[PDB]
Design a protein around this ligand. Sequence first.
Ligand SMILES: NCCc1ccc(Br)cc1
Lengths: 229, 325, 276, 49, 222
Amino acid sequence: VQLVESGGGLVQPGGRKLSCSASGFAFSSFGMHWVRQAPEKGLEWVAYISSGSGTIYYADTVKGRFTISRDDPKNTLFLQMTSLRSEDTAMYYCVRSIYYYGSSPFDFWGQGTTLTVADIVMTQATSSVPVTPGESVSISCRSSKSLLHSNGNTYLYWFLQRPGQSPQLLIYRMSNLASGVPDRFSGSGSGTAFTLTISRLEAEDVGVYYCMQHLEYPLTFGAGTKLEL
Amino acid sequence: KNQIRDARKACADATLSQITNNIDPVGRIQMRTRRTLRGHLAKIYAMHWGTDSRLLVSASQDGKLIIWDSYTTNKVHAIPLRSSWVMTCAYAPSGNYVACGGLDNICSIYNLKTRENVRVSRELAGHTGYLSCCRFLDDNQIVTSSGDTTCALWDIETGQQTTTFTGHTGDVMSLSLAPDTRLFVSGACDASAKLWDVREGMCRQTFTGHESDINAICFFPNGNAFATGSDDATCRLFDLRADQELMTYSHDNIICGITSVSFSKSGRLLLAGYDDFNCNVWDALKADRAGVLAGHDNRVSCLGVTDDGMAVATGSWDSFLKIWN
Amino acid sequence: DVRASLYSLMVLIILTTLVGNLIVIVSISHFKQLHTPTNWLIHSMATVDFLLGCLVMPYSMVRSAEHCWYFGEVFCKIHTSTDIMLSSASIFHLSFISIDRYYAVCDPLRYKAKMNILVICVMIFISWSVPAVFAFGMIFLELNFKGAEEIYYKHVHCRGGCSVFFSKISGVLTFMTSFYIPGSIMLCVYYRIYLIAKEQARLISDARKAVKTLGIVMGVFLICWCPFFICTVMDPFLHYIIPPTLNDVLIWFGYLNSTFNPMVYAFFYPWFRKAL
Amino acid sequence: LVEQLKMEANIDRIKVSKAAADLMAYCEAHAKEDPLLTPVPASENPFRE
Amino acid sequence: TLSAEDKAAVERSKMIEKQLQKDKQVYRATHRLLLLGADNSGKSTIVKQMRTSGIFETKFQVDKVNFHMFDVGAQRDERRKWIQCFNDVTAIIFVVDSSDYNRLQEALNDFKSIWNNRWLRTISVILFLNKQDLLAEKVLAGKSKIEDYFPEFARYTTEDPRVTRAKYFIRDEFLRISTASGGRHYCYPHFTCSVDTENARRIFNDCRDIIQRMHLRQYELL
Ligand SMILES: NCCc1ccc(Br)cc1
């Protein structure tokens, strides 16, 4: 599957449309997300549009400033930006998602395009863990409230962004590995405290680790820990 | 031929009813429908629970497979079939695949877990008659019984019949896999059931004495016994070791035959769907009808008991499923 | 003696109406096998008849036996509007049942496509709305009483309670709206269906139920409403010489039709009898 | 045909009483965790009103 | 349902339900027919002219009315089981080769089995009789005595008169079985040449009559 984005660049304040063209999957059956990542910050959920455009959810910071749309016959997603501010200068990622019982949302992420001009809070206490290859690594995270719902599912997702490329899903709901991720990552938690551990350590495991809560749509990502070699 | 019958008669030391005459019978088991799964267009011909005991796939004569979320009634998947008439469906033990078959002599295997929706992973061809039952051994092999009086173990990766099972004179209507998944049973319209060894690929035992064509079959959870249901309004329970029938579940009131037979988790409850619009629950050790599952407006066609045994799903010809608990 | 007998007969009619409508409504509502598009119209007609019974018949019996109205004008206007609305709704439901049968037995290959849930819902909405708007606008805005203030005052003295007085033009308009177009549609549709059924029966015999069924339906619809509506239409042009007894009696023909409607549209058909 | 019958005839068989006892033992052993046979509390099942 | 993921699952289920509603709209506005016959008959020729697999489905539309026609392919001789799948079809088009003179009794037995089937009650049968032209040269050329196969042909009365007499003898022999039993379903005999374009039209007419009579019986006007 592929999700390639187009658009972005240098714009004066107060002013674009970003396009995300899909090729390799049934675009109409997947919900879509736009997620920001500032150079000086981590990932930031921006927008979400459902499979049938029935429900659309927006970032708390920008609600009327951005608009989102999709066309299934062209298999394309559009984010139109209105009244761009200084803070709206982050990398934009077009994230595939799908929600049924046993699904793995946020599984595929686009490469992204550069752009220059009451919700729960999750903080990762550590900023960077110094470790050595071949040793188990532990990354901890916390949430402002019990993240386990009445269904028994805890809606926490762990993503790894290897330097120089887009993030890729590692863990969803702390008990489920992703599709192609190595069988050395695992997650655990109790509702508030959350921990991802790697038994081994390879060269490709270097990157930035992010945690997100999907209990509520205004999505609270995490600070992200840089797994320095 | 007569030697086997004589040996079976000699081995019958006593009837199971006499041994189970002194036990305490279970009371009137009252089960109420907790969920109604609707959306199918035509009559429902088959269903199969998942090993997770939450997902279940059902097949409709309109040419549609539907994978439900039985806990929340949501419709997880809707697969449109290439052939309108489907008479069987199976759900893979790992949950990655679903099978169906019908009037077309094809077993369609659909891959649920795709990077893409749901695509047909394989189209097993080679059977001469219509498929009546298909059951997954694992993600790579599947046993399908058809209307040309033959069963077949396939290799999904290759698509060719790894093994063929012959010996039935009438077309096979249903099959069930043992819990060990090393051998299975097949009931045919020859008014007999046959035990096939998957590895050996040959018939092991033959059970007769069941008047009409067998419409459904299932294993006892222990794996050493199996219950059959046919069109003469009676259910039989055969024991593999004794090579004979143990008890007979029938009533003078019941006239129409059975379409589906299932067991409880412990084997104490035998649930049989009937053409008379509802299902009967029997004490499997005393042959006493303890409980009736009424509420279907047409003939019951498929039953299923979850692996954990908490609920039983019933699908019939009114295009509605009901989750009794 | 006469008053007691009249009250007993009215109470029996009310009980029969309410019962039959209640069984019909609960039968279509509860049973999932009777949820066909053609059965929701019958359910709505039963609801109309039940509402007519409960909201009209006790009060009509009181004003016809005691020959007086206890309440004031506020309740009188509401009762008259409800009476007209529910009678017209029942007649419209009968007409839509006739149209549904026409599409069932004259365009058989496209019956399920043409007569689906959307179309029957539109029919039910029309039957519940057009009579409602017509009755409320005609009664509450004094449309019928317009141009006949002296006649209304004279009828007030003769009929101390409430009367459904109608003027010369308004009476003709409401007769057309509530009995002519639905009645003509029913009559022509049923004549065509009778011809089709007779031809089919002759063809089958070469290689009657229709007469009895259609005669029963048309007679039940006619012997009740046609006298009442004919007298209502002709009375303003006849200089108001209609005796009060014919009008109370006539008012009772309609309720008898509401009583008979479940029996003739749901109890005459063996499938409903087996289901119930 | 004849070979299959001969193979089926020469199999090991046990008395019906032993099989009945085995089924009774399995049913009695596993009756403790049978939700259909023993009604589970309404707060311990995923199918509740 | 309170959760976000459960809400998205619910909306996916609602989209599935909308697709199923559209499929139901298509499914109600079409008529399903079961085509039966034999190898010697012209069922394949009929379906070709109109428009190890176990079934073949044919779509044909006439007067803006859609007709599914299912013809079972590679199946065993016994059909008492899968025929239960066709208890809700509009009609059963039974095709007979009239020029065989040998499989005619087999066709009669098959039609008797289908007509008296327990699951096929209230399902009407449309008789197509192919090879009418072949029957014509067979009758006019002689060398094949019709009375030899059926002794009652000689003691029976109604192009050449002999061809018409044979055609109507076969038709009466077929309709005697239908008239022997049944009031819930009817037989509609027809004569079809090797290649005729009126097959769809007469199927449409017979289906219209079948549904009209079923509706009249349902409302008790017959
Ligand atoms: N129950 C009949 C009441 C009625 C009165 C006037 C008109 Br115009 C129609 C109906």
